[PDB]
Amino acid sequence: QAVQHVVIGPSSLIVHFNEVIGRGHFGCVYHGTLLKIHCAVKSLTDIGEVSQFLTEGIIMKDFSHPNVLSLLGICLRSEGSPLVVLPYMKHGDLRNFIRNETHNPTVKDLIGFGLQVAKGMKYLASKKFVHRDLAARNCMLDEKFTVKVADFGLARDMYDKEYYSVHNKTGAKLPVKWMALESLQTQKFTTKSDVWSFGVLLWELMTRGAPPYPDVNTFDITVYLLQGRRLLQPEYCPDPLYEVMLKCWHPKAEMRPSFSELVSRISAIFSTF
Ligand SMILES: C[C@@H](Oc1c(N)ncc2c(-c3cnn(C4CCNCC4)c3)coc12)c1c(Cl)ccc(F)c1Cl
């Protein structure tokens, strides 16, 4: 009854299953058109699982912000598996874009990307939402180069499966090199642990998509961080911005900035650059 505003109609969605764009563990992503909106469509067994899927769809549908990727709707089909419909992001993920050599953002542009992610995250935080996997690969770019925080809720997956590693006991693939210390220990995530991930994302931006800790093995990162060791300041990263990243990696989660504070500080840095 209350899901009607989330559910997409009978002949209102056209999906192109021949042309694929994404490969998540929980499903593949295709091109689509929604009546005219260009979409990305992810295809995802029983009534209890469907109902859960609907319920969280209603919850996620009311997340609205220019720096957060929106859910356009859902299209459950009696014959097939449910389809999650999202707006098509012309310039793909933020990591591949800043690695794409045919493009050439400035340092200023790269700082403006980080400012936008902080705004998107500032919004998510205010709704008590914890992302759990904030990273350049999960932030998308539209035709205007507006950055949209993404890969949370219904379309939550691991698409680039290279940067996810299994903790043996729990049996869950985690992005350890984007994870706060206390999250590696306790396996528990908070908005303050998103702030950690945001510091890493900034490092990604300033290095133009370089992988974090290439010389530290996935099973050594906890010890590495325990020892006080942190990512180096990138060559073209301004000092005040490195000071910001270091505050994000504070051993105590309590002492890390908020996303509100970060929007304020990066916007100051952006304005003087
Ligand atoms: C679920 C899926 O959503 C997408 C959304 N919402 N928008 C665009 C894409 C593309 C994609 C794949 N290629 N391109 C462009 C990149 C620039 N050259 C033309 C093609 C875009 C792949 O996936 C897209 C996705 C994927 Cl696969 C990975 C990370 C994400 F955050 C999201 Cl949100």
Side-chain angles (χ1 to χ4, degrees):
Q1 189 184 234
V3 78
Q4 287 280 53
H5 77 279
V6 186
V7 175
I8 296 163
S11 306
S12 189
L13 175 64
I14 299 162
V15 187
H16 305 96
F17 293 103
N18 55 342
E19 192 180 356
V20 185
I21 55 168
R23 302 177 192 280
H25 215 116
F26 300 121
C28 303
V29 196
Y30 309 90
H31 280 281
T33 39
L34 175 60
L35 295 82
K36 185 168 282 186
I37 316 300
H38 199 134
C39 308
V41 188
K42 195 194 191 191
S43 188
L44 302 173
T45 64
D46 64 327
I47 311 309
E49 282 180 330
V50 170
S51 306
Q52 174 165 190
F53 160 84
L54 294 169
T55 299
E56 69 182 304
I58 296 163
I59 286 169
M60 296 323 187
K61 186 67 189 304
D62 293 69
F63 280 65
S64 191
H65 192 263
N67 304 126
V68 165
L69 180 67
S70 41
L71 172 74
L72 295 187
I74 62 191
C75 176
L76 39 278
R77 41 185 180 178
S78 195
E79 193 213 8
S81 61
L83 305 169
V84 187
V85 187
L86 310 171
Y88 181 67
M89 292 290 103
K90 176 165 193 159
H91 286 126
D93 71 271
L94 187 47
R95 200 226 187 198
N96 276 177
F97 180 88
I98 66 190
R99 289 172 63 73
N100 185 9
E101 59 181 34
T102 40
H103 289 99
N104 197 17
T106 56
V107 168
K108 187 163 177 58
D109 292 332
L110 295 160
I111 302 164
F113 292 155
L115 179 49
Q116 292 187 51
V117 178
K119 288 177 182 187
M121 287 311 306
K122 177 183 177 178
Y123 172 80
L124 286 185
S126 75
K127 302 283 176 163
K128 319 182 215 175
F129 191 79
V130 182
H131 197 293
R132 303 178 288 182
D133 193 7
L134 180 54
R137 69 173 170 281
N138 295 328
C139 289
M140 301 294 290
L141 253 63
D142 74 343
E143 79 279 57
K144 304 161 178 72
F145 308 98
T146 308
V147 179
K148 308 258 184 183
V149 173
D151 198 29
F152 62 86
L154 285 171
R156 195 195 176 185
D157 216 326
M158 303 160 206
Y159 297 102
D160 187 12
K161 307 189 293 185
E162 190 202 306
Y163 298 87
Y164 295 91
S165 311
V166 191
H167 183 288
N168 296 37
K169 301 291 183 65
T170 190
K173 317 105 193 180
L174 296 162
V176 299
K177 288 169 169 186
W178 282 262
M179 276 171 63
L181 197 49
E182 76 283 5
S183 298
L184 292 160
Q185 296 166 311
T186 65
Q187 210 187 334
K188 305 220 277 202
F189 300 81
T190 64
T191 282
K192 289 305 189 199
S193 72
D194 284 347
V195 169
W196 184 289
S197 292
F198 179 70
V200 184
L201 186 153
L202 287 165
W203 191 86
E204 282 184 285
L205 283 162
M206 298 317 299
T207 60
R208 303 181 179 275
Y213 321 98
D215 299 339
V216 181
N217 183 231
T218 157
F219 289 79
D220 300 334
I221 195 75
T222 307
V223 169
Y224 190 81
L225 298 169
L226 250 48
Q227 288 173 343
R229 303 176 185 278
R230 296 291 180 266
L231 292 163
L232 298 177
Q233 174 171 187
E235 286 176 318
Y236 298 104
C237 181
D239 299 350
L241 187 62
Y242 189 57
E243 290 170 354
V244 164
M245 295 172 197
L246 287 173
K247 288 167 191 151
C248 292
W249 304 323
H250 195 288
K252 303 185 180 180
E254 168 58 28
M255 295 289 284
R256 287 164 209 156
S258 63
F259 282 113
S260 192
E261 182 189 314
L262 284 164
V263 168
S264 187
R265 288 170 174 271
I266 296 171
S267 65
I269 289 166
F270 182 77
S271 72
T272 60
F273 191 93

